[PDB]
Write a protein that binds this DNA or RNA. Structure first.
Ligand SMILES: [Mg+2]
Ligand SMILES: [Mg+2]
Ligand SMILES: [Mg+2]
Ligand SMILES: [Mg+2]
Ligand SMILES: [Mg+2]
Ligand SMILES: [Mg+2]
Ligand SMILES: [Mg+2]
Ligand SMILES: [Mg+2]
Ligand SMILES: [Mg+2]
Ligand SMILES: [Mg+2]
Ligand SMILES: [Mg+2]
Ligand SMILES: [Mg+2]
Ligand SMILES: [Mg+2]
Ligand SMILES: [Mg+2]
Ligand SMILES: [Mg+2]
Ligand SMILES: [Mg+2]
Ligand SMILES: [Mg+2]
Ligand SMILES: [Mg+2]
Ligand SMILES: [Mg+2]
Ligand SMILES: [Mg+2]
Ligand SMILES: [Mg+2]
Ligand SMILES: [Mg+2]
Ligand SMILES: [Mg+2]
Ligand SMILES: [Mg+2]
Ligand SMILES: [Mg+2]
Ligand SMILES: [Mg+2]
Ligand SMILES: [Mg+2]
Ligand SMILES: [Mg+2]
Ligand SMILES: [Mg+2]
Ligand SMILES: [Mg+2]
Ligand SMILES: [Mg+2]
Ligand SMILES: [Mg+2]
Ligand SMILES: [Mg+2]
Ligand SMILES: [Mg+2]
Ligand SMILES: [Mg+2]
Ligand SMILES: [Mg+2]
Ligand SMILES: [Mg+2]
Ligand SMILES: [Mg+2]
Ligand SMILES: [Mg+2]
Ligand SMILES: [Mg+2]
Ligand SMILES: [Mg+2]
Ligand SMILES: [Mg+2]
Ligand SMILES: [Mg+2]
Ligand SMILES: [Mg+2]
Ligand SMILES: [Mg+2]
Lengths: 77, 76, 52, 51, 64
RNA sequence: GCUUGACUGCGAGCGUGACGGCGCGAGCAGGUGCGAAAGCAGGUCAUAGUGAUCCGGUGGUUCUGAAUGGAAGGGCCAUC
RNA sequence: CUUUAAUGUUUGAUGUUCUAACGUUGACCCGUAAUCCGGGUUGCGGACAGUGUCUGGUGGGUAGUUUGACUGGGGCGGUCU
RNA sequence: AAUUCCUUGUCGGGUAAGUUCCGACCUGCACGAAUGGCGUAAUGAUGGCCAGGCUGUCUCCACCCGAGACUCAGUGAAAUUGAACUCGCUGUGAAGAUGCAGUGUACCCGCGGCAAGACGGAAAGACCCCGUGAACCUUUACUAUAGCUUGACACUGAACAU
RNA sequence: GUUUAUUAAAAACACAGCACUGUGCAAACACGAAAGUGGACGUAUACGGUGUGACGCCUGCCCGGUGCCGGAAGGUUAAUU
RNA sequence: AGGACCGAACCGACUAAUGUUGAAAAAUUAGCGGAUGACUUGUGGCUGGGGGUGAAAGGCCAAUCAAACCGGGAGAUAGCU
RNA sequence: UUUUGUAUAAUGGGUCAGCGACUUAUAUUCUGUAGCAAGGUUAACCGAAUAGGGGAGCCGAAGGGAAACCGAGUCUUAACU
RNA sequence: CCAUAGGUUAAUGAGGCGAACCGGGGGAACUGAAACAUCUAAGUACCCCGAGGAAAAGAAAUCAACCGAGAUUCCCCCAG
């Protein structure tokens, strides 16, 4: 499903407004993108489904550090 | 049709009759045009409404060349 | 209705004003009148202004 | 005890009259209803503040 | 449950010493210029609630 | 002819409305105008020329100001 | 200042030459007894396409509703202060 | 004219007599060319009209054969029903009377029949109206919205040319 | 030939044919939040949609309105800055 | 050769009568149409309710269809009787 | 039963028996009644516990004003006889 | 090419059921507004996930107001 593998962002629901404030249910989905991240330690490319906000934290945190937290959650690669 | 229109009645006429005791400021008659004219101790409003300027009995009388009807207050 | 309402502002600077109407086709000149000002408790000249 | 025979004086209508809102089950208008007009506590303007 | 006061009526009526309710006069919002000064002056002071509407006001204001 | 009473604060007592309300008002206070004065003037001979509340706008205001000083905002007055 | 021309300074607009993101419902290899999927090799495309947020337009495609009363029945006409 | 209101248009044909049919007229109230026009063999439980044959369709019904209806034995319902000692007439009367008034008539009770009435039975009227009822459907009704489309930003980086 | 099973079988629908239009194949389109599937294991001599309705003779005039298509100079105009 | 002809099975259901507390909650009798085909039929399978399916009648989707049935919101609401 | 009006040929009922419709909770106002009284009364809770404790609070004895404020006065107004 | 993916064993653990209560992911409409859009109904009904005997919450980047209080939960007031 539409879940970020780094930040865990998932679709959320809200209202479409209008000039008359009429509220209709809607969904907000993350800006998810499938990217192949280069992991130096394994000298390999690993593909992750990440949001655009997740991409920013990867540079700040390091490719190895983020993957270590994901392994704590536990998943396939 | 193009008719069938009217306005609410404004309740004109004599409110206090001859010999009635009235308080100062009480209107005696509401009218259109000077059917009655103000006499002694009687005021005239901007719409020719006659009001009492003193406490006393209402008296109607006819005097003058025009054979008009006048309202006066005898303040005892 | 084409006559438009105007305000007459006192010259004393109290900020009190009266309101009235005036004909725009004629009498272009501003309206000046001596009217009582409750703030100064005196009759002063009131000057035409714009309602806003 | 209404609606318990002729002799009781409140039978066959329960004191509710004849086929009005008050005679309906759960019937009756809300507080302040003036027949359709906006009620007096809405014809008049708000004033003041709470200190 | 506790009775809920009509909040719209609570912002326009205040209880007086003898149990009455005072309200401000209407007709003095935005067409007042064409009204004579005497008319505006009489509408400025506070007014008493009429006897016919006393029952309706008390129903809307059960806690005051 | 001269003028702005088409005045400000009020108002005894009445009228008419179920009510909201509408209408009339001597007189009082402060300041005016016209008269030599008595006096008259709170618009127009009178009765049509009009629209409640909410919301928002403008001016004024030592009323309020969520720790305190302000302020925002609100209130009041004028007014759209 | 106008008509402007050149000159210095800034965002963009297309076009192109790229590949490295991204795309490949091109080829080949492997997982593999597999027209799926994944990985690899290669070709092509390529900072587009495509998607997310925001935003303008369009939208009976699909919804929720409105569409007054009086009235010699109703509608039509007329009327509403 | 599957279209013509006036209208049974007018003329002709058909009939003893044709508001239909067929042929024309054009005055097309208010035909008309792919929301197709005009024709068209064949086809049609297709629509209209005519003729022959044929006949109880009818003039005008008669008889006969069966199955019911009728009687006996056995078994044995139903809809409906405020209660009935449940006549006619005229008048009255939620304004069309078995029940009121007046008056007339009528011994008590079955069976076979007919349906004039009991505003007969059936089903809280489908027409009409109303409710600030319901639902579907339409659209340049309102307010939205899926979808489609536009641009900015992100995914998305580096040279060159104008 | 088909149709209102249970009051309507028709002049209605379908029909072969005709024309317009969309669609270059990761096709348009449709079903699916998506993946995907149908279209089609087809490729414009194909497919979808629309109207007309064998055949015969033919199908005239209007692009103002409403749509659609093409253009983009100017006017106006969102998010953003 | 033929969505050819006549005509049984088979399938349809045009007319009339009966029946309408039916023999039968749609049939029977006498006629009627198709009857090698766009036929008919058996056994399985698939499409699900604002959806399906429909040679299109708002038809059909378990004797129910201008939005199936069952349960729930729910003692909806009902200025009406 | 519903109506201006029903023997009405307006609705209802074949009959009997059983069942079948103004309740409950909370708050508020008014009346009656009882207690205390310028005071009245506790709630949760404690508690061998329908007692007692708990006065946290609530209403009343002072109002006027939008409010600040003032106060048997107060507001309105420059000021009110 | 190492590797990695993958593959074969062996150990543990989980699968389902069950009334309500609880947390979380989704989430109506009828209705009320005497219509109806904001609003109400209602984060209710319902669906889904998970846990326990309770769950959840919980040890101040909290309140107060220049005095102070000192986690969370629950009850009565404050207060319609
Ligand atoms: Mg009685
Ligand atoms: Mg009644
Ligand atoms: Mg004059
Ligand atoms: Mg609704
Ligand atoms: Mg009407
Ligand atoms: Mg004709
Ligand atoms: Mg002839
Ligand atoms: Mg002919
Ligand atoms: Mg035509
Ligand atoms: Mg055409
Ligand atoms: Mg024929
Ligand atoms: Mg013959
Ligand atoms: Mg016989
Ligand atoms: Mg029986
Ligand atoms: Mg009888
Ligand atoms: Mg009779
Ligand atoms: Mg008999
Ligand atoms: Mg008979
Ligand atoms: Mg109506
Ligand atoms: Mg049928
Ligand atoms: Mg038929
Ligand atoms: Mg056709
Ligand atoms: Mg053109
Ligand atoms: Mg055009
Ligand atoms: Mg054949
Ligand atoms: Mg044949
Ligand atoms: Mg059939
Ligand atoms: Mg019959
Ligand atoms: Mg049966
Ligand atoms: Mg045959
Ligand atoms: Mg259908
Ligand atoms: Mg139809
Ligand atoms: Mg059916
Ligand atoms: Mg529906
Ligand atoms: Mg159900
Ligand atoms: Mg409910
Ligand atoms: Mg019910
Ligand atoms: Mg009867
Ligand atoms: Mg009956
Ligand atoms: Mg008592
Ligand atoms: Mg105790
Ligand atoms: Mg205390
Ligand atoms: Mg006083
Ligand atoms: Mg409503
Ligand atoms: Mg346990």
């Amino acid at each position: 499903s539409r879940v970020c593998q780094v930040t865990g962002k998932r679709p959320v629901t809200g209202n479409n407004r209008s000039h008359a404030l009429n509220a209709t249910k809607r969904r907000f989905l993350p800006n998810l993108h499938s990217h192949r991240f280069w992991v130096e330690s394994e000298k390999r490319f690993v593909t992750l489904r990440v949001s655009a906000k997740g991409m920013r934290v990867i540079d700040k945190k390091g490719i190895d550090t983020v993957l270590a937290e994901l392994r704590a959650r536990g998943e396939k690669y | 049709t193009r008719n069938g229109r009217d306005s609410e009645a404004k309740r004109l006429g004599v409110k206090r009759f001859g010999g009635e005791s009235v308080l100062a400021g009480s209107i005696i008659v509401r009218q259109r045009g000077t059917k009655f004219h103000a006499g002694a101790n009687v005021g005239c409003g901007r719409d020719h409404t006659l009001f009492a300027k003193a406490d006393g009995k209402v008296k109607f009388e006819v005097k003058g060349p025009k054979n008009r009807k006048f309202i006066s207050i005898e303040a005892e | 209705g084409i006559r438009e309402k105007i305000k007459l502002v006192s010259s004393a600077g109290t900020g009190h004003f009266y309101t009235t109407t005036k004909n725009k086709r004629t009498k272009p000149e501003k309206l000046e009148l001596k009217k009582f000002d409750p703030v100064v408790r005196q009759h002063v000249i009131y000057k035409e202004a714009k309602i806003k | 005890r209404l609606g318990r025979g002729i002799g009781s004086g409140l039978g066959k209508t329960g004191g509710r009259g004849h086929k009005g809102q008050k005679s309906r089950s759960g019937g009756g208008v809300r507080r302040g209803f003036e027949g359709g007009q906006m009620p007096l506590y809405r014809r008049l303007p708000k004033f003041g503040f709470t200190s | 449950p506790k009775i809920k006061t009509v909040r719209g009526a609570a912002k326009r009526f205040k209880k007086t010493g003898k149990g009455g309710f005072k309200h401000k006069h209407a007709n003095l919002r935005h067409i007042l210029t064409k009204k004579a000064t005497k008319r505006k002056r009489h509408l400025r002071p506070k007014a008493m609630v009429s006897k016919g509407d006393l029952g309706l006001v008390i129903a809307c204001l059960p806690y005051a």
